[PDB]
Each structure stands twice: as structure tokens, then as C-alpha cells.
Design a protein around this ligand. Structure first.
Ligand SMILES: Nc1ncnc2c1ncn2[C@@H]1O[C@H](COP(=O)(O)OP(=O)(O)O)[C@@H](O)[C@H]1O
Ligand code: ALF
Ligand SMILES: [Mg+2]
Length: 426
DNA sequence: TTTTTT
């Protein structure tokens, strides 16, 4: 039983073939309105998002899954690493509209990599292969994570590190609408404080509403979720729950060469009945995708049985990761698998990073924000909850947790003064 | 520091 704000009506006919970027405060109804348009579109829509949890929340898959995109940045001079199977092309030409939720965490070059890969399959110079595309997200929440060495690599090509700095907006553009009804939260004394943490204009008197969060009793269990700034805090929290007793350890097996730096899974996956888990890969067959959460019910020597948040029981077998590297063969340069690891594609999920929690909704969260470092990271971390009564904090909410990004004010200025559009018009 | 492939 959902409301359609007057703004939501204003969008829809704009699409029936210009592109559109829809933004608005945390819990303004972006991710739900998105779900509703996939029905009322008449177009074959394919849904993807930068991270698996947000993707699961929106219906679809990660952007790297969808477009077979390797991890590192991709320049105009870099060669496309991966080719598409004939299924994934079927998926992409049959696609009429592409969606992207939590667009704010998407690097500029991802879009250009998606641009190039789509122009290639549609055999056209149309931007994106002439595929209408609509973007959901919010710039004043989390930006894309990049690692500085990656950043200078793209400073050679990009005047900025946000999704709108994609070079294909030199060949096309999008409209911009701001949904303005915050649904998820109801107390305005609350709501007013986050809108201000969002736009960097909050005062230490409004921050004194958030005094209650410091040091409240754990009413569990209905149990709490822990969302953190760093994985260090994540791994400790879940080891703290779960505990040392009644445990089953499952060790990774690693064929040859695969450095512990980039093993994408748990080395020693320790679990007990009733442990809260997340799945890390996609298996269409069984139906698990990377982001879904479950509850573990049956641990045998080689199969882990877990019942998902959606309801269906899965039997997890182990999954194998391959370390493909580039090497020299009979005077040929070729990606040869130099190793492999094999664990169950599961990890503990009583605690997740604030990054993985963007897009989600909760009734009782626990936040660990004493060491924030990204703009809008605090803002995401405490806008997840419907009510304040339901949030705990590891430290007081100080203004040192708010980090403004002035690239974002300029971007609003640019589009708000030019009729809510951005990029080349046609 | 934070995420992410077929
Ligand atoms: N149109 C709506 N009418 C009523 N409640 C809504 C609406 N949209 C969202 N909500 C409530 O807010 C929650 C989160 O909204 P969501 O769409 O996830 O926000 P975001 O735009 O930040 O993704 C939903 O789970 C629902 O409880
Ligand atoms: F952008 Al959201 F919950 F999807 F804040
Ligand atoms: Mg969303």
C-alpha cells in the first residue's frame, strides 16, 4: 500500500527518450518508486547497483556482475578485458531501459565502461547504444570508493570523481528531479536534524537531540544490526557475537598462487547454528545472489543449510575463485589461471560496513562512527532507522564526523540553474 | 580507511 507523491507522477511521463537522474533525501522513496516503474514501464528493464546489498534491495545484480567489469579503473586507452557470452548479449539487446540505484557510489569510468560495452554490442555510436537509462541515488550520501592510486590514473581523463564526470555526458545528458517526501522516518524533530547533517548546515544545538544514542541498553533479542566504518570493527563484532563455543570452522583450500591480499572470501569461516550470514557470490541455479542475508540452520561436513531473509532454504556448496593473471606463453601474452581458492560463499553478517548498508531500512541499528572518513558516511549510517528510539551509538555524534564535498554544491548549482538538466541536450 | 566481474 504505497503513496505516489505528485513528483513521482511528474517523473513517469518524462520517460515515455531522454535519460533522467532521480535524487532525494535518504528514505524519500527512490528505491521503492524504482521498483514500481519496472511494472508501469512497458519496457524491458534490467536492474543493477554498485554494491550487492543495494542491488538485492533493488531487484538486480552488481554492476560488475552485469557488465563483466574488472575491479581496476578503465581509461579510454585501456582495452576491454572481457567478452560477453551470447546469453548476456540476449539480455542486453532485449533490454529497453537500464536502471542504476545508489548511483552516487559509481565511479565515472564505470559508466564509460558501460557506455563502451553497450555501444559495442548494439554496434552503434549512440551513447550507451541508444538505451534509455534512469539513475537513482543521492550525491550527499556516499561517494564511490576509489583508492588514490586509482584516482590519479583517472585525473588524467576526468575533471572529477563522481558519476556525472563520466565522459559520455559530453555526448548525452539527463534530467534531474528531487523527490521531497521523506517516508522512512516520521518524527520531524528527528528529520530536521538529518536534513541538516546532510547539507552540512547543522548546529550543535540540533546535535543535542542525538544525545540519547550514547550508551543505551541492548534490548536483544528482534535483534540489532551493527553498521561500522571499518571492516576491522565488522570482523570483531561478529566474532564477539557467535562466540567461541559450539563452533564449526571451515578452512579455505588454495590450489597454487593466490595472495591473502585479494582472497575474496573467508579464510577460516567459523559458524554456529543461528549465525547471521551474507552470501558473497551469485548462483542462479540455487538462486542466491551476493547481498542476500540468511539464518544458518544445518551444518554438515560439506553443505551449509541456511534460510534466507526472503524465505527459501538454500543448501550452500563451496565455491571456487580463480586467480587469473597475465603471462607469457609460446610468445603469446595470455591470462592463465595461476591459482584458486575454495570456501563456502558465506560470511558473518551481524555487522556490515556503513557502505554495504546504504539503501537499506531498519528498526533497530547499532552504529560505530567514532572514526568516519567519507562524506555523508555518518548521514547514511544514522538515516537507516525509522525512529531514533531504535538507534545506538558507539560515541557521541560530533561535527567532526561531517565532511563536506563542495564538488556537490557546484553540481546542484549547474543543473538547478539550467532547467534541471545536465550534459549535452538533444 | 571504503567496493567491485563473466
Ligand atoms: N511512497 C512511499 N509511501 C510510503 N512509504 C514509503 C514510500 N517509499 C518508501 N517508504 C518507506 O520508506 C522505506 C525506505 O524507502 P526507500 O525507497 O528505501 O528510500 P530511498 O529512496 O532512500 O531508497 C520503505 O521501506 C518504506 O517503509
Ligand atoms: F538511498 Al536509500 F535507503 F535507498 F537512503
Ligand atoms: Mg535506494
Amino acid at each position: 500500500d504505497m503513496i505516489l507523491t505528485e513528483e513521482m507522477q511528474k517523473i513517469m511521463n518524462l520517460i515515455q527518450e531522454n535519460n533522467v537522474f532521480v535524487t532525494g533525501k535518504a528514505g524519500s522513496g527512490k528505491t521503492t518508486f524504482l521498483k514500481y516503474l519496472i511494472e508501469k514501464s512497458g519496457k524491458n528493464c534490467i536492474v543493477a547497483a554498485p554494491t550487492g546489498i543495494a542491488a538485492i534491495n533493488a531487484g538486480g545484480v552488481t554492476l560488475h556482475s552485469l557488465f563483466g567489469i574488472p575491479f581496476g579503473p578503465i581509461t579510454p586507452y585501456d582495452r576491454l578485458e572481457n567478452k560477453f557470452s551470447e546469453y548476456k548479449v540476449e539480455l542486453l539487446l532485449k533490454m529497453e531501459l537500464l536502471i542504476i540505484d545508489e548511483i552516487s557510489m559509481v565511479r565515472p569510468d564505470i559508466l564509460d565502461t558501460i557506455d563502451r560495452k553497450l555501444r559495442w554490442v548494439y554496434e552503434s555510436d549512440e551513447p550507451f547504444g541508444g538505451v534509455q537509462v534512469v539513475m537513482f541515488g543521492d550525491l550527499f550520501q556516499l561517494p564511490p570508493v576509489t583508492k588514490k592510486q586509482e584516482r590519479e590514473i583517472l585525473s588524467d581523463f576526468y575533471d572529477g570523481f563522481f558519476f556525472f564526470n563520466a565522459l559520455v555526458f559530453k555526448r548525452t545528458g539527463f534530467h534531474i528531479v528531487e523527490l521531497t517526501k521523506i517516508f522512512r522516518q516520521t518524527e520531524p524533530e528527528f528529520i530536521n536534524v538529518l536534513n541538516n547533517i546532510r547539507n552540512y548546515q547543522v548546529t550543535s544545538d540540533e546535535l543535542d537531540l542525538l544525545s540519547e544514542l550514547k550508551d543505551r541498553k541492548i534490548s536483544s533479542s528482534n535483534e540489532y544490526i551493527h553498521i561500522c566504518t571499518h571492516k576491522a570493527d565488522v570482523e570483531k563484532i561478529n566474532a564477539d557475537k557467535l562466540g567461541e563455543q559450539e563452533i564449526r570452522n571451515y578452512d579455505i583450500v588454495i590450489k597454487d598462487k593466490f595472495p591473502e591480499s585479494s582472497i575474496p572470501c573467508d579464510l577460516h569461516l567459523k559458524l554456529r547454528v543461528g549465525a547471521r550470514v551474507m552470501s558473497l557470490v551469485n548462483d542462479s541455479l540455487k538462486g542466491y545472489y551476493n547481498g542476500m542475508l540468511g539464518i544458518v540452520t544445518a551444518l554438515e561436513d560439506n553443505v551449509i543449510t541456511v534460510r534466507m531473509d526472503n524465505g527459501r532454504t538454500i543448501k550452500f556448496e563451496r565455491y571456487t575463485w580463480s586467480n587469473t593473471q597475465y603471462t607469457l606463453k609460446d610468445n603469446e601474452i595470455v591470462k592463465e589461471e595461476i591459482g584458486s581458492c575454495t570456501q563456502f560463499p558465506l560470511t558473518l553478517a551481524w555487522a556490515i560496513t556503513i557502505h554495504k548498508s546504504q539503501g537499506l531500512t531498519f528498526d533497530k541499528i547499532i552504529i560505530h562512527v567514532s572514526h568516519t572518513f567519507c562524506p555523508g558516511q555518518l548521514y547514511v549510517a544514522l538515516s537507516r532507522c525509522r525512529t531514533l528510539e531504535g538507534i545506538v551509538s558507539d560515541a557521541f555524534i560530533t561535527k567532526q564526523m561531517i565532511i563536506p564535498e563542495y564538488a556537490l554544491i557546484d553540481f546542484e548549482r549547474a543543473y538547478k540553474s539550467e532547467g534541471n538538466y545536465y550534459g549535452k541536450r538533444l
